[PDB]
Design a protein around this ligand. Structure first.
Ligand SMILES: N[C@@H](CNC(=O)C[C@@](O)(CC(=O)NCCNC(=O)CCC(=O)C(=O)O)C(=O)O)C(=O)O
Ligand SMILES: [Fe+3]
Length: 292
């Protein structure tokens, strides 16, 4: 018996759970990373039903529905002994989830270190979770060293992560990639940092007049809108926004310091442990930083 304090209250787990259902992408990733193949998982946001990078670790994992509204009947049918939920997706059905199986919840879906710690405790894989996080911390420390070596007096760089969607544009100031960049020592322009300090993670922008909020020494562009009915609309948004005088006046744009066509799965959708290491690898490549 283990008692866990989490985002939605306290949960008693009897035993070492062996049948876990993961209700957000990162939880699925973390379960696999901890050596526990979920019996059930929400479908992937793209490459449905299972992201290519992980699907061979999810063979026989049953799909329990879409992350915004998983199918409680399908979860029930799996006879899970642990459900991993989030307040952001599942707050309103948390009691219903708890009637099926002990359910633990993080606040959101993208804080993969919190997911890893919580799931480590819930699964009796605390030592495994610690080793995963040590590996990430090591990679972060090495990146900071290599970045300082390349950029010298210009380190730290300011970064922004700009996401073109079908009908608006976002800045992932925090969120999955924004928090990782923060770990890596990248900073934000003062106005963007003020948004973060005010508790904003993901900023939705509706006007090209807001483009200056994106200003940075380097800009990472992600084309992603999983639930758009028309994939072409993301490209239309990118075309319109990147064609504006505002975009052309950004520091990174002027200096040819924009990384375009980044993999949305690595940069946002997967949400998990494995992608964190991959994102850091991407940065060595896109920034031409010697792993020295
Ligand atoms: N967007 C759509 C489709 N999903 C995505 O594209 C991925 C993601 O949901 C991942 C994420 O990390 N969301 C942040 C969760 N925390 C919140 O505060 C709610 C924000 C939220 O999910 C939203 O406002 O869209 C994303 O939006 O990046 C949705 O959600 O069905
Ligand atoms: Fe979303």
């Amino acid at each position: 018996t283990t008692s866990i304090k989490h985002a939605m209250g306290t949960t008693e787990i009897k035993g070492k759970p062996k049948r876990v259902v993961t209700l957000y992408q990162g939880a699925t990733d973390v379960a696999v990373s901890l050596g526990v193949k979920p019996v059930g998982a929400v479908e992937s946001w793209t490459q449905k039903p299972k992201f290519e990078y992980i699907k061979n670790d999810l063979k026989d994992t049953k799909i329990v529905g879409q992350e915004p509204a998983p199918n409680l009947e399908e979860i029930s049918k799996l006879k899970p002994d642990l459900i991993v939920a989030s307040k952001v997706r599942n707050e309103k059905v948390y009691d219903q989830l708890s009637k099926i199986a002990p359910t633990v919840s993080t606040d959101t879906v993208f804080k993969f270190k919190d997911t890893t710690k919580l799931m480590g405790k819930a699964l009796g894989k605390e030592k495994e979770a610690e080793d995963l996080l040590k590996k990430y911390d090591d990679k972060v420390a090495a990146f900071q060293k290599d970045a300082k070596a390349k950029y010298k007096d210009a380190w730290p760089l300011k970064a922004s992560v700009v996401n073109f969607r079908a009908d608006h544009t976002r800045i992932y100031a925090g969120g999955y990639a924004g928090e990782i960049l923060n770990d890596l020592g990248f900073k934000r322009n003062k106005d963007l940092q003020k948004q973060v300090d005010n508790g904003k993670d993901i900023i939705q922008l509706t006007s090209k007049e807001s483009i200056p909020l994106m200003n940075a020494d380097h800009i990472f562009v992600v084309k992603s809108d999983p639930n758009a009915k028309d994939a072409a609309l993301v490209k239309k948004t990118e075309s319109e926004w990147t064609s504006s005088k505002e975009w052309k006046n950004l520091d990174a744009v002027k200096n040819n310091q924009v990384s375009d066509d980044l993999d949305e799965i690595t940069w946002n959708l997967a949400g998990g442990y494995k992608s964190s290491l991959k994102l850091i690898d991407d940065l060595y490549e896109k920034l031409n930083i010697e792993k020295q």
